[PDB]
Nucleic acid binder design. Sequence first.
RNA 1: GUUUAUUAAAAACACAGCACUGUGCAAACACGAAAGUGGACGUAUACGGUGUGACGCCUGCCCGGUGCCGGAAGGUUAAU
RNA 2: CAAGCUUGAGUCUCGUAGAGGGGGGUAGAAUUCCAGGUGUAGCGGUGAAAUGCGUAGAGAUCUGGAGGAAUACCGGUGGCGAAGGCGGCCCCCUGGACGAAGACUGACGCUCAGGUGCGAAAGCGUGGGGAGCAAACAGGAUUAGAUACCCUGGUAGUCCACGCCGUAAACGAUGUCGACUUGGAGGUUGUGCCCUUGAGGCGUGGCUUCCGGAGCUAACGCGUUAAGUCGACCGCCUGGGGA
Lengths: 56, 88, 271, 106, 55, 129
Amino acid sequence: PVIKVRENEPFDVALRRFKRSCEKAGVLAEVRRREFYEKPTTERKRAKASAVKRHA
Amino acid sequence: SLSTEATAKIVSEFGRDANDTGSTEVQVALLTAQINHLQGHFAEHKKDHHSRRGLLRMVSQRRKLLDYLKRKDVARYTQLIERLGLRR
Amino acid sequence: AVVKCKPTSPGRRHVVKVVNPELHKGKPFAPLLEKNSKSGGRNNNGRITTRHIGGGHKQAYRIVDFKRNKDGIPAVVERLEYDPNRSANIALVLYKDGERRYILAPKGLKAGDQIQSGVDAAIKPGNTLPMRNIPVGSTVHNVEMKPGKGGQLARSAGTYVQIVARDGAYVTLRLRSGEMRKVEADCRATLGEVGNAEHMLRVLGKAGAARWRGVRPTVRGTAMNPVDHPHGGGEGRNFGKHPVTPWGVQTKGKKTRSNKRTDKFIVRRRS
Amino acid sequence: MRHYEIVFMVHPDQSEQVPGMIERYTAAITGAEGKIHRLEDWGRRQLAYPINKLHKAHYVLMNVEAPQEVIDELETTFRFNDAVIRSMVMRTKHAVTEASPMVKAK
Amino acid sequence: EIDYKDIATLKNYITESGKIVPSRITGTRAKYQRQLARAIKRARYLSLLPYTDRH
Amino acid sequence: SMQDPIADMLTRIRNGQAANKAAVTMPSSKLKVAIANVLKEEGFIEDFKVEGDTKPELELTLKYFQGKAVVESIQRVSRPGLRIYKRKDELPKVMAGLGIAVVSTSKGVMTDRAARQAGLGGEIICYVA
RNA sequence: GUUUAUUAAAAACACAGCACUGUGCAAACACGAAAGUGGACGUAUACGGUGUGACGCCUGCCCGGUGCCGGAAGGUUAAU
RNA sequence: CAAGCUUGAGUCUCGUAGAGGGGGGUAGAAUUCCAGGUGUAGCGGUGAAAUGCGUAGAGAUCUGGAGGAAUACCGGUGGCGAAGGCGGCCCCCUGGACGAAGACUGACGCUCAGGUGCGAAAGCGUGGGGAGCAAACAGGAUUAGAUACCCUGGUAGUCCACGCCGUAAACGAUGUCGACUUGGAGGUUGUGCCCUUGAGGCGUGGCUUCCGGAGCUAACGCGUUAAGUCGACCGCCUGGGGA
């Protein structure tokens, strides 16, 4: 998720690009996720629950 | 498994020709070869259960074919178990 | 293989013996035997300096080669022999010039196996070579400490030093105790673990079996009278001391290494 | 007699020794009735991540019909040999006498 | 046809950060996405592609 | 697997009659053709044909009245599990007249009625309604 | 099995097994003002010490007291 | 009982996909600890705190080292396996499935009481290992109480080898085998014909997801992968507690 500011650029465009580069990588999704152990039975259940829902 | 080289060798002997691949005597012979090759695999690899399920299918299939081969003709049956070495 | 002998008498009930079929049956190789007469734990003043030793069975001394100093010349393993002086079994080897010697038998080594010493030698179990010429990672045995002196570390059954680092003249060894230790790297080491690693699984099963290995009874301080031991007297079963040796030094805890000249070579004391 | 495909890569200070290694290995395959369907030498190339501290190392392709017996002499020599840092032998279901994408692009 | 040596092609199917890209996005048939990911997983061993973008 | 092929024929009728098919085929045999004939003489089916030398194929043509089946219902009686023979006084009659049993006698397959006139019994194959 | 030769043979000692602890080899430890010797022509699956005592099921709470182990900032402290 | 047949059942030939199994190597990320350098007063934790770690220099940051365990992304109502289950990459040993065209045996089949094998997790045995997590246990909170939920620690265990144990909401709460009976939308894996002219047009196998018709069902629902229409064999039920 690495970024620089090239010359004749604002600060505020670089800080925007930082965030649209990090939501594109899913750093924070991939860190929420490993806060707590999920038993595999629970992982499979939530997966099903999403798939059945998204039939809409 | 067997190779093709080893397979053709076996159809040769027990058959009539190379196009009598599926006679009862050949099927028994192929299974017997295929079983004894595996006895080395299972010497080394005792905890391999999923493969042994396959072995035991050969064994049971052979024993079905030999029971057929008695009801047909005991001339061929008694010849075959000597030649292959079975029954013990 | 270990063998739970069946309980026909009360002294056979718990015996577990370590049968090796692969060993030699018949008398050991004659030129390499010596007289080796027993001490009963007594020194040149006749006094018991070491308690509990005494008696047992007669034993000839097999002259093992711990040096392995005969170089570039390949050698074939003739047989594995029993050795009573030693937890390890030993192997008779025949060199390509018709010399024989005994060596320690490493794990995975049978009749017919070539084994070679010196610097050319291939990195395969049996083979001895200076520790500059071994890969870091490797698992070795019968390791020297000064160059040329002979193997001292990792000779018992199932043991192995393990090489963890190079750094110039020296190398570092995780010894089997758990003690990291520098040794200077011209020192030899055979490769492999040492054999007979089921030796710990044996059970002697009766008193007499200990006597056969030359090991007399051991009397608890708390049994004795006060004149004989610090643990002394009591009407009934008392204690109320802090545990001590017969000569009054604390056991259970108290460290007893004072040796300052060897300290620099010890990276880290055992865990 | 099976087909294999052996990328190894070499400590860049011993780019000196590279053809001497090739000519041993390539001989020792044909010594036991092998082939060598191709050999390339992509030279010094930049590593995607440090290995043993080394940025840069000297890659070598090699595609080879052989038995299993000689391939273990080859896997063992790679392990003991310090100059060779990293190594792969894949298996393959035909031969491949061709140039790669690495040589073609230039 | 898809091939661990061909690190031109493999770059279309990784990120900025050297994560393999999902078939969902790229539009790729699922037979080949298996071959892709296996290619990429070898490439990374040989240091031709990277695991991350820290280096 | 495939252990009562008469019941198979009877089911293939029943299921075709439910699905409003003009015709159904199966593997032929001798005995199927015998029954197929009785069923035709009694007017539950229009006609049967047989085609093939090596793997012959019985094709029954099914029958409807008021946009509705003729074969109201069709049981097997003698199964492989449970063979059911009957003496001539003990022969069943099916809807008290109006259907037909089908009996294998020593003089071939025929109706229940036509075994009472002939004075026979035997293995009862199937009822029809 | 052993034991109070000469009033005690035992439930006492020992034991195979278990646990803790010391010991990296010029080992710990022991006998010796020392040289030296045992340990061991052994090398941590080895050796010394302590307690328990086949086997089976087990082995709970307390680190305030006394030992031992580790820690070094600060205090106190000898010869010099 | 005798003699046949080739459609059921098998054998051979050639290919394709696959976290199928067993053994051996190896890669990178991260946590923990150990030894250093920079650095200074907090860190950590929570609903809020405290116990805890820290001026004996913690946390933060950089360098080097040890070790164990698990394999991000790919990854999917995707796949394989009889079930339990199976997930980095590479090699060695190995089981099954499926498809195409032809050849071969000639009913060799289906089911199975007793019998034999396989069988998650926990647990037990002998010996290794031990990073993280974590029953027991300890302290801190909360509370009327808190033998709990929450916090700080933490031992068996989790890991490997070889033995046992034989159980689970081991579930699709649906025994195995075979036949027949309107449709639609997809996924996955083969294969044959087509200005391959396009990632396409026309068919033909296998496995699988969701709708839903007739019929069935007490109803919910099932619905060509049936809980519909039949046949073969097996297992099991006969009020609730007691159990």
